[PDB]
Design a protein around this nucleic acid. Structure first.
Ligand SMILES: Nc1ncnc2c1ncn2[C@@H]1O[C@H](COP(=O)(O)OP(=O)(O)O)[C@@H](O)[C@H]1O
Ligand code: BEF
Ligand SMILES: [Mg+2]
Ligand SMILES: [Zn+2]
Lengths: 49, 417, 417
DNA sequence: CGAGCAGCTACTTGTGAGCGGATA
DNA sequence: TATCCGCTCACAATGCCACACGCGCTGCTCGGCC
RNA sequence: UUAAACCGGCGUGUGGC
């Protein structure tokens, strides 16, 4: 998985998977558009990256 | 402000406090998150925080400060410490680091410790002027610690029994061998209350492994000192985590020339937890254990030793037998020869509601002359000799009877004569 | 400079020494690291070091020099030796190589031995002019070694008991069969102190296996010679490591025509350790042992032999019985017929506080005429005959009484008549 | 513990412009 | 101080297709935020 | 809120038109 603040990252660029966060806490469609409690990434498609 | 001053307060009190501080009602988050948000708000107010935490190092390099009420576990109230302090003072695991802390910004998770103020209730120079644990000379138990309460109560029985069977000293390694349903937990409570009420000069620290949550609550608010527990709501990983926490804390406190008593119950449960956490090595011995899966428990039971130069480390640990399985029996085999203090609780007398059910036959003390004086040993030996006429059941009768008529040791000795 | 001259000094003294040498305060690293850094600094000063270490070879080819206070273990103070010296002198395991050493640079870990100076307190030509251990002729014990101290003390009892029951000679193989709680460790201390105070001409070397750290400290500073111990803080691998260290050291010292006495306690513990370190062979015999898992212990107990051409190797080893398990019983079976000296300690007399609890019935000596002269055997035989009227308990009474009234062997013999 | 950082190529040809340059 | 003259560097050199290949071991240093 | 399905970038060499 990407580093916290390395070259590859999620909270800086976007989720590495479509509608799936890095921690797997938010994975359904209801949480689409909200950030998690530690990484704080807007869960969405990979195109954002 | 500080951690324990908020953690020894209940959850409703913390919710009311956070709502009084003008915050989003914190009755929705856990108590640890409540205190975390309260500290974040207090730091937002324009000031620093003064925190305290016991120290943990992983293979990364920085330090984690776990709190007391968290049972030394992972949580948001654990303080971050940059590895620079570890490179400076070589702070190993087991410091109640007390110092100034600041709130974490974005990209961070925990509070960062700015400067050191208190190193195990000592000056930070003790962090650079002290002796390690592996280098000193372990000795036998010199000091004698009385167990009897002194009120003539019905549970005083247990204490005085032990006092006339095998006393307890600083630096001892006590192992209790008892089948299920023998009165273990109330024995722990009785002996802890007696050692803490009769001798407040010595420090107590009780360990609970795989008990019920009601047992945790009954243990935590009843005995003095820190009450660390690790129940089933955490896996064997967090079991070994809290175990290594408390052992390194005791080691460092002993290095600080302090008397540390560790109650532990039971050893078979932590041995199973360790077997769970250590991978296999291709071979399985009797009972289903590994080769190195015994090295952790061995070390854990043998860390006890008497420090003649200052401080001491005594442990009182119970074991599980008559469980039907094999691994518990081999564990008892391995740990019955490594301890310098062995005691046994019977089950046949226990199920007859005749308590306490001490095995006066298999009870023993390693090098008891350093724990018992001239005529003291005279009295103890002649009573052992007169109880020696082969007896378990009516031997317990004689003991409990002559113990219920009398109040102190000298009363029994001078009335039996 | 040298190793033992710094290792027999305490840890605080070494810390003060390293701080006096102008160094980073070494109270943060272990004592072995303290001495390592002190040697590195002394070598940085512009000079060489003169070190000493007992030799170990693995399947690699080079040599490791383990130190005395390290209990012959792996550590930074172990000196590296290039295999060239092994190809030159064929230095097998068990040389206290004493020689010149230089500090290690980057890419290295330990000091490198430049040249040989002392080979087991002998000229390096003895490294090329000597005889191996497997080639000489093992014989029976010729010399007689008195055990009684000669002060009439209360522990002299034990010694004189053995002296009138079964004496000890050079090249003997003694096995003590004793249940738990029979007075083993103080017996070891008593007999070692007597052999080292009465006969300083013979060399002592005591082995401790699976004892308490306080027992290690009480053994290490009380008896003469090297006190090697291997407690539970090391796994069975390091157990067998130190065991093979000491056995090859004794073998080489005997090859150097020296008298080497090896105290060992107990054998069942090292047998369990070996069973732990040897893999299975698909089959498990009685007690849970393997086929080849007995070959190591067998060899280890049978390395004892009397060298009639020069030097001797005697062993005094204790065994564990009445442990409830089977493997200890089969181990005792295997080792009760392989020894050339058998003695037994009773537990029923021991728990009556009547010490020492010798089994005068099962005590014996292989070919005792080579250990006892004409009228000497006359006296011993007639006393055995008069004690022969079936007795354990009041037999111990008679022995201890007639032994407490008297001071030496001849006094007892000429007062009983 | 991870990751990295690193020690362990060479007779083009032209066409063009920018930059000395030197020299009275 | 103008006016070429020449030195020196940037920039370039068809399009596709097909196939194959290798883009490493180990000592040292640094990072200090599960 | 519930059910079903899914989750070649570079360089080199060679050869051909
Ligand atoms: N020679 C002796 N004289 C007096 N007391 C003894 C003697 N030998 C043993 N004992 C007693 O027997 C006990 C044996 O101690 P311990 O080390 O627990 O058992 P063991 O030595 O058999 O392992 C000691 O507490 C000691 O008081
Ligand atoms: F010290 Be006992 F013999 F284990
Ligand atoms: Mg012993
Ligand atoms: Zn997340």
């Amino acid at each position: 998985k990407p580093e916290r603040d390395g070259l590859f990252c999620a909270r800086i660029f976007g989720p590495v998977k479509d509608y799936e966060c890095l921690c797997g806490k938010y994975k359904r469609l209801k949480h689409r558009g909200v950030i998690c409690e530690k990484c704080g990434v807007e869960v969405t498609q990979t195109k954002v990256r | 402000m500080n951690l324990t001053e908020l953690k020894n307060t209940p959850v409703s009190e913390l919710i009311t406090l956070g709502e009084n501080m003008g915050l989003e009602n914190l009755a929705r988050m856990r108590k640890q998150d409540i205190i975390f948000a309260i500290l974040k708000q207090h730091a937002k107010s324009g000031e620093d925080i003064f925190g305290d935490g016991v120290l943990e190092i992983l293979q990364d390099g920085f330090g984690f400060l776990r709190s007391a009420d968290s049972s030394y576990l992972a949580g948001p109230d654990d303080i971050y410490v940059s590895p620079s302090q570890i490179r400076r003072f070589n702070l190993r695991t087991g410091d109640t680091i007390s110092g100034k802390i600041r709130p974490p910004k974005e990209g961070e998770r925990y509070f960062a410790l700015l400067k050191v103020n208190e190193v195990n209730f000592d000056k930070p120079e003790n962090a650079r002027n002290k002796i390690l644990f592996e280098n000193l000379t372990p000795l036998h138990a010199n000091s004698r610690l009385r167990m009897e309460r002194g009120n003539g109560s019905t549970e005083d029985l247990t204490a005085r029994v032990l006092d006339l069977a095998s006393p307890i000293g600083r630096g001892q390694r006590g192992l209790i061998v008892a089948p299920p349903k023998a009165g273990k937990t109330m024995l722990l409570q009785n002996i802890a209350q007696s050692i803490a009420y009769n001798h407040p000069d010595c420090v107590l620290m009780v360990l609970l492994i795989d008990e019920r949550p009601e047992e945790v609550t009954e243990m935590q608010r009843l005995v003095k000192g820190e009450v660390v527990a690790s129940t089933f709501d955490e896996p064997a990983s967090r079991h070994v985590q809290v175990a290594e926490m408390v052992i390194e804390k005791a080691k460092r406190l002993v290095e600080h020339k302090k008397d540390v008593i560790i109650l532990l119950d039971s050893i078979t449960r932590l041995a199973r937890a360790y077997n769970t956490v250590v991978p296999a090595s291709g071979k399985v011995l009797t009972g289903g254990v590994d080769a190195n899966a015994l090295h952790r428990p061995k070390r854990f039971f043998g860390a006890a030793r008497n420090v003649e130069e200052g401080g001491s480390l005594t442990i009182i640990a119970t074991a599980l037998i008559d469980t039907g399985s094999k691994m518990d029996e081999v564990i008892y085999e391995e740990f019955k020869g490594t301890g310098n203090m062995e005691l046994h609780l019977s089950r046949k007398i226990a199920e007859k509601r005749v308590f306490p059910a001490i095995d006066y036959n298999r009870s023993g003390t390693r090098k008891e002359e350093l724990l018992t004086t001239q005529e003291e040993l005279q009295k103890m030996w002649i009573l052992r000799k007169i109880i020696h006429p082969m007896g378990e059941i009516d031997a317990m009768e004689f003991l409990i009877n002559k113990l219920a008529m009398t109040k102190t040791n000298d009363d029994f000795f001078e009335m039996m004569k």
